[PDB]
Amino acid sequence: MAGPLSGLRVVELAGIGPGPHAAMILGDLGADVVRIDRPSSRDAMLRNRRIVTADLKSDQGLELALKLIAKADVLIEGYRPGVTERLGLGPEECAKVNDRLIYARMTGWGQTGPRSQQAGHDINYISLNGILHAIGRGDERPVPPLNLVGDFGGGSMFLLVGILAALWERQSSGKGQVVDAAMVDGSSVLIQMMWAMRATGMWTDTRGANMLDGGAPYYDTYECADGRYVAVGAIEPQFYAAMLAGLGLDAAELPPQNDRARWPELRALLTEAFASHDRDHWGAVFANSDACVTPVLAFGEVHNEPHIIERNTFYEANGGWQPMPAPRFSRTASSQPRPPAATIDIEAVLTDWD
Amino acid sequence: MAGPLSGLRVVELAGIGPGPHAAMILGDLGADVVRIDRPSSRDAMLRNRRIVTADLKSDQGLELALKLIAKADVLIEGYRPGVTERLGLGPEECAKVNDRLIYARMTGWGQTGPRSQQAGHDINYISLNGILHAIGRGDERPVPPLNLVGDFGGGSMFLLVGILAALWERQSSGKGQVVDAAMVDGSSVLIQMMWAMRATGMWTDTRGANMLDGGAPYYDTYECADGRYVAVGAIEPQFYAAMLAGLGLDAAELPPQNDRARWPELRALLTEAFASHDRDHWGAVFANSDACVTPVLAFGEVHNEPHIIERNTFYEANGGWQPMPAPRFSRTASSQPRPPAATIDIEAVLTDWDG
């Protein structure tokens, strides 16, 4: 099996949220990943996986599950606090059969505190920690950044960092441990830049009035003549100037870049410039440029972008394109993900692992 | 030093944005982090760091730098491809002093290809891979989700994944390697769920017409009577039902939760309901609920939320509140971050690290 986590044995207790994402990625990098589903798949998030059936409420299922967990490096679960404990799969029960296990717990709210048993989704976790208030235009109610920021970026990604951090520790202590990964904590670290900039007076709580939230006329999208969009990220003055020259606008006839009092006027000027040609024009004009102008591509167009193609960011599956693993490694490269491996019997897996 | 990454040694080549975030987290979890800045020169993103200065262009600076790297486990750099090579700090130059080193390269576009030399920011990397198009209301131009998805989510965090995964490989091979972390890549995997759903007919390229993009009336924010907001995320029909009841609305007077054709009509009804009372009213009503309704708090209000306070998600620092390390660990717990360690001289670090 190809990649830098060849060897690594992962047991994943089937649940819904980010937990699979973290499991996918480990598999992506060549880890051995067995997911225990209930008895009762076309979801491409389940790639790089062997699937097995096991009723965990049963006595037979609990026995066979605890066997797998015995000869393995990592467990992932994302049930509410208490569920694994009441199943007899909790940390303590697991430590008894394998004190080398990395016990990874994917929740939104964390293992303790007043919200810990409340149901929720991505949007709830980021509602409470300030993130969601800060996404959107100022004349508009906040907008969910899909579920990128809580479930994945501040969620699964931190589960992964915790796992692999713990595996490092285990090389120098012999012992596993519990990784407590709460979306509400991870997302807060994800946005640590804003918390820092707040302290230096460099970020306000006013939505859509900051450098990075769409309030800066030079960090935003613009509609073009065809109704499609470009992105502009010309923060640095030298890139901004480049952007102006390519728009045919003369810097002396514009307000200063960062006179925020005149951003309305500046947005007016850039809006008229960008609206006078279609998106593809601007893409071509600003190719190889440092203007920080790129076409805003829809999912369907991504397979035609030269830089996407030539770097093999995507690979083909049934039902269409999917992203190749990330990041990349020089010696032990990852490899094209395999589909999910149709129900193995949990027995046959136990044979396979010693 | 406290945390699972005790005595990981990390050399950070000063740059902006993604790379330092990665360096911060490694430090946060107790790795030993040395940041070589420029002699040219209170960003709390530089916490859990020792800082040293060194013109990397001078002959001396390049030797001192290569001497650190030789006594270290990880190198982080976020310059354009080619820059470290030219300076003579490139992968090959480093694998001469240290076949064990993990060489971490943090870019937007990646190491090769048409755009590899092009300047950019977060908004640019996510513009090219479908992400930025998918964000915002349908009657409005896409809005950048700050720089959370490219720089961090799809950026630093994939660098971290790659660094730590490469340390695991280093154990059954004895050798380092190059980790190539491109934001256009990581953010693509970050959004794998949407690529998945696209394939099964369960996500459109149409903006604001999806389950998770704000189009669904049950997965969106709502304005309250006081002009503050609540978040609703009642995807599962049982949570939604609980939500309706708390709203005082009779399910059988309302269109189906998942008749997309009628979402604007459903939304009109929920909008009126939520408008009728202020935010804190809903927050109390829906406490301990599974209605998936939460107050949308502004940063300044976050220090007053019980669930925040009780779990110590934040610590106070000189200025204002800062996030505590994540994730958390049962045994080797992270400690509260230390401010940045004033301009150490690179020799002092070299004594301390074996010698």
The answer, for B310 touching chain A at a CB cutoff of 8 Å, is yes
Are A164 and B167 a contacting pair at CB < 8 A? yes
Distances B43 to A147, A199, A207, B21, B213 between C-alpha atoms, Å: 28, 9, 22, 11, 33
Please state, in angstroms and rounded to a whole number, the distance separating the CA atoms of residues A78 and B92: 42
Rounded CA separation B345/B39 (Å): 11
- Partner B contacted by A304 (CB < 8 A): no
- Cα radius of gyration (chain B): 24
Experimental method: X-ray
> Would the CB atoms of B45 and A196 count as touching at under 8 Å?
yes
From B37, B121, B277, B278, the catalytic residue: B121
Q: How far apart are CA A149 and CA A349, in angstroms?
A: 35
**3-class secondary structure for B88-155?**
CCCHHHHHHHCCCCEEEEEECCCCCCCCCCCCCCHHHHHHHCCCHHHCCCCCCCCCCCCCHHHHHHHH
State whether residue B312 sits within 8 Å of chain A by CB.
Answer: no
Q: Residue B76: beta bridge partners? A: B12, B104
Domain extent listing, chain B: 9-190+329-352, 219-307
- Is A151 assigned a catalytic role? yes
Question: CATH number of the domain at B9-190+329-352, please?
Answer: 3.40.50.10540
**Six token digits for residue B351:** 């004594």
- Fill in the DSSP letter of residue B339: P
Q: Report how far residue B73's alpha carbon sits from residue B199's, in angstroms, rounded to the nearest whole number.
A: 41
CB A150 within 8 A of CB A126: yes
Give the total residue count for chain B.
355
Helix (H) or strand (E) holding A320, with range, is: strand A320-323
Written as six digits, the tokens of A123 are: 């949007």
Contact B154, A146 (CB under 8 A): no
A9-192+330-352 CATH: 3.40.50.10540
Q: In this structure, are residues B87 and B72 in contact, taking their beta carbons and an 8 Å threshold?
A: no
Q: Is B205 part of the annotated catalytic residue set?
A: no
Rounded to an integer, what distance in angstroms lies between the CA atom of residue A48 and that of residue A30? 8
What gap in Å lies between CA B148 and CA A302, rounded to an integer?
21
Q: Would you say the CATH fold of B219-307 matches that of B9-190+329-352?
A: no
**Which candidate in B151, B180, B185, B220 is catalytic?**
B151
Q: Which residues 6+ apart lie within 8 Å of A48 measured at CB? A: A24, A26, A27, A28, A31, A33, A337, A338
Q: Which of B191, B104, B210, B128 is nearest to A24 (CA)?
A: B191
| Residue partners of A344: CB distance under 8 A and separation at least 6 | A50, A51, A52
Residues B337, B47: contact at Cβ < 8 Å? yes
Write the CA distances from B40 to B14, B36, B37, B55, B56, integer angstroms. 11, 11, 8, 9, 12
Declared resolution, Å: 2.4
CATH of domain B219-307: 3.30.1540.10
Half-sphere exposure at residue A259, Cβ-oriented, CA atoms within 13 angstroms: 8
Cβ count near A333 (within 10 Å): 15
Amino acid at A186: G
Is there a contact between B225 and B277 (Cβ–Cβ < 8 Å)? Answer: yes
Q: Taking the alpha carbons of B245, B248, B252, B253 in that order, is the dihedral positive or negative?
A: negative
Report the DSSP pairing between strands A320-323 and B50-53: unpaired
Cross-strand bridge partners of residue A105: A77, A180
Rounded to a whole number of angstroms, the distance between the first and last alpha carbons of chain B is 20
Residue found under tokens 């001192």: B64
- A130: chain B residues, CB-CB within 8 Å: 297-302
Per DSSP, the residues of B304-332 read G-HHHHHHT-EEE-SSSEEEPPSSEESSS
Number of C-beta neighbours around residue B227 at 10 A:
10
Contact A158 B327 (CB under 8 A): yes
* Contact indicator for B165, B31 with CB cutoff of 8 Å: no
Element (H, E) at B182: strand B177-182
Give the separation between CA B81 and CA B62, rounded to whole angstroms: 18
- Does residue A316 sit at the B interface (CB-CB below 8 Å)? no
* Strands laid side by side in the A102-107 sheet: A341-344, A50-53, A32-37, A9-13, A74-77, A102-107, A177-182, B328-329
**Residues in A touching B157 (Cβ below 8 Å):** 153, 157-158, 160-161, 190
Read off the DSSP letter of residue A310: T
B122 is in an annotated binding site: yes
Q: Say whether residue A312 is in contact with chain B using an 8 A CB cutoff.
A: no
Of A125, A42, A31, A114, which Cα lies nearest the Cα of A78? A125
Return the ∠ at Cα A298 (arms to B189 and A16), rounded to 5°.
40
**Do B63 and B55 meet the contact criterion of CB atoms below 8 Å apart?**
no
| Residue of B94, B189, B303 to mutate, interface with A, max A Cβ within 10 Å | B189
> Which string of DSSP letters, residue by residue, matches A93-146?
HHHTT-TT-EEEEEESS-SSSTTTTS---HHHHHHHSSTGGGSS-TTS-----T
> Which ranges of B212-278 would DSSP assign to H, the alpha helix?
237-247, 263-275
H or E stretch including A53? strand A50-53
Q: Provide the CA A280 distance to its chain's centre, in angstroms.
A: 29
Give yes or no for A130 touching B (CB within 8 A).
Answer: yes
Residue B215: helix, strand or coil by DSSP? coil
Q: Does B280 touch chain A (CB under 8 A)?
A: no
| Distance, CA of B221 to CA of B232 (rounded, Å) | 6
B307 near A CB under 8 A: yes
B220-223 contacts, C-beta under 8 A, 24 or more apart: B220/A123, B220/A144, B220/B267, B221/A123, B221/A127, B221/A132, B221/A141, B221/A142, B221/A143, B221/A144, B221/B296, B222/A141, B222/B270, B222/B271, B222/B274, B222/B275, B223/A141, B223/B271, B223/B274, B223/B275
Whole-angstrom CA distances from B286 to A26, A289, B272, B279 are: 37, 51, 17, 11
Rg, Å, chain A Cα set: 24
Considering CB atoms only, which of A21, A124, A311 is closest to B192? A21
Q: Report CB contact under 8 Å: B189, A326.
A: yes
Residues A123, A144: Cα–Cα separation, whole Å: 6
Answer for the pair A30, A328: CB distance below 8 angstroms, yes or no: no
Among the partner-chain residues B182, B231, B310, the one whose CB lies closest to the CB of A114 is B310
- Residues 243-272 in B contacting A (C-alpha not used; CB under 8 Å): none
On chain A, the residues whose CB falls within 8 A of the CB of B151 are 193
Q: Which CATH architecture has domain A219-296?
A: 2-Layer Sandwich (3.30)
Minimal CA separation from B263 to chain A, in Å: 17
Report angle CA A233, A239, A240 to the nearest 5 degrees: 75
Ramachandran bin of A282, using left for φ above 0, alpha for ψ from -120 to 50, beta for the remaining angles: alpha
Can you tell me the distance from the alpha carbon of A134 to that of B195, in angstroms, rounded to the nearest whole number?
26
Q: Which residue shows structure tokens 């190198």? A: B75
- Structure tokens given for B270: 């929920």
Amino acid at B296: V
Owner of token pair 């090579």: B85
